[PDB]
Design a protein around this ligand. Structure first.
Ligand SMILES: O[C@@H]1[C@@H](O)[C@H](O)OC[C@H]1O
Ligand SMILES: O[C@@H]1[C@@H](O)[C@H](O)OC[C@H]1O
Length: 444
């Protein structure tokens, strides 16, 4: 009664360049804003950096053979700007383009469809020094990079995502100081949020011009299910503000050419650097909307976040090692909201997964029953979305393998494949062996 996904459903895994590649000085790559941020005392919980990570730069063929064992028909990765244009603009680093050619050819040779993210947070440092996200000149810098890389690969890459999680780039990078470049200012976050949207909309016709009739592109939004802690008017309004901040701030511009008006007023409307024609650019038609979903966030009126006047509440329930509530209904809820309000022609889940404490048994196995249960419940929510008529075309598990989890460093393991950092040994987890069966059965 709750069995099979559509016959051409895309089952994948996802990664990003800085989280897995390592070889940070190899083959002409220049430092990213993350290579510099990892130097800051207190920025990374375990004091780690992405300098080596999974060494996927060297080990990609072995990682693609693991993908074949998992039976995925798709693979979501990001392209490092610092390998392609190490001076940020101008001179193409041929050897960096060459890595992504070898990666894309190794994937298509194994029948794995490439889903390429253009921007997953690793701007070159030298380019951030000229154009941070809050400087409108960042838009043409991103379009130039997009132009260069899409010209080289669009014969072989059909699916293109512009930027990964505008909320993270803007708010964690410039509003909360938790991600590179590590600034913390309401105005800088709002400028960066606007310029991310404009870089999305200006990139879109360049991806299309450099491609063919098969080329599909879209943006990737992180979205979480937001819940008021109670029916108190103060708590309902706290939830609505947080929802406006987290979920609607990017979606409303993308589909309706407006920011959420109540939150825009709350902030100071003049702080957002909107020019005439900007919403026409931001609303440029997309082929799909990609969604990164992890959790339910429960909000009360409070002062924890002084910017939004909210506190977070943990309902009784199940939490990952990140302290993120496990709420698979939230994924159905988000997909249904997007379907009803915006009618994207296609939806992808480009990230969903969990971090739990993992150990290699005496027998060399990784028994992760809480990660397996996490995935089973979310896959079941996706199946329900499809049965309700929501045009969900694919699902990418975060992550293929344990990697550098940004401010959490390597202590949080998201992989369905375990990495022994002492040896770079990959061990497919119990959750990975289970997924190996889901992909092959195309269902649960
Ligand atoms: O994507 C985001 C994560 O990387 C960070 O820890 O804070 C919020 C998340 O949704
Ligand atoms: O890259 C990932 C990000 O997109 C998600 O929200 O945060 C977890 C990271 O693993």
């Amino acid at each position: 009664e709750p069995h099979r996904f559509p016959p051409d459903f895309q089952w994948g895994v996802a990664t990003s360049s800085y989280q897995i590649e390592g070889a940070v000085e190899a083959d002409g790559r220049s430092p990213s804003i993350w290579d510099t941020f990892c130097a800051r005392p207190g920025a990374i919980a375990d004091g780690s950096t992405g300098a080596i990570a999974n060494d996927h730069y060297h080990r990609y063929r072995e990682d693609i053979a693991i993908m074949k064992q998992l039976g995925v028909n798709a693979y979501r990765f990001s392209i490092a700007w610092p390998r392609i244009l190490p001076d940020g603009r101008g001179r193409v680093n041929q050897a960096g383009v060459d890595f992504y050619e070898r990666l894309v050819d190794s994937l298509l040779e194994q029948g794995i469809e490439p889903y390429a993210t253009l921007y997953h947070w690793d701007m070159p440092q030298v380019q951030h020094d000229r154009t941070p996200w809050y400087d409108r000149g960042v838009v043409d810098a991103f379009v130039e990079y997009t132009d260069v890389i899409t010209r080289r690969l669009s014969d072989r890459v059909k699916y293109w995502m512009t930027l990964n999680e505008p909320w993270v780039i803007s708010f964690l990078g410039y509003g909360a100081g938790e991600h590179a470049p590590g600034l913390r200012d309401k105005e800088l976050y709002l400028r960066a949020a606007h310029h991310v949207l404009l870089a999305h909309g200006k990139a879109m016709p360049v991806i299309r011009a450099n491609g063919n009739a098969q080329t599909k592109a879209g943006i990737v939004l992180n979205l979480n299910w937001v819940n008021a802690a109670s029916d108190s008017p103060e708590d309902q309004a706290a939830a609505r503000r947080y929802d406006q901040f987290f979920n609607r701030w990017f979606a409303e511009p993308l589909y309706n050419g407006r920011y959420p008006e109540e939150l825009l007023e709350w902030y100071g409307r003049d702080l957002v650097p909107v020019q005439p024609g900007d919403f026409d650019i931001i609303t440029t038609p997309t082929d799909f909307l990609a969604v990164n979903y992890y959790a339910r966030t429960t909000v009360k009126a409070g002062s924890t976040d002084p910017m939004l006047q909210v506190d977070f509440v943990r309902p009784p329930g199940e939490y990952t090692a990140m302290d993120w509530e496990v709420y698979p209904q939230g994924l159905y809820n988000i997909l249904n909201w997007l379907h009803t309000d915006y009618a994207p022609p296609a939806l992808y889940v480009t990230e969903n997964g969990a971090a739990y404490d993992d150990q290699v048994s005496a027998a060399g196995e990784v028994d992760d029953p809480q990660r397996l249960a996490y995935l089973e419940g979310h896959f079941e929510a996706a199946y329900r979305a499809i049965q309700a008529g929501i045009p969900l075309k694919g699902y990418f598990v975060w992550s293929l393998m344990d990697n550098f989890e940004w401010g959490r460093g390597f202590e949080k393991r998201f992989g369905i494949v375990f990495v022994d950092y002492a040896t770079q040994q990959r061990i497919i987890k119990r959750s990975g062996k289970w997924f190996s069966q889901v992909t092959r059965a195309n269902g649960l």
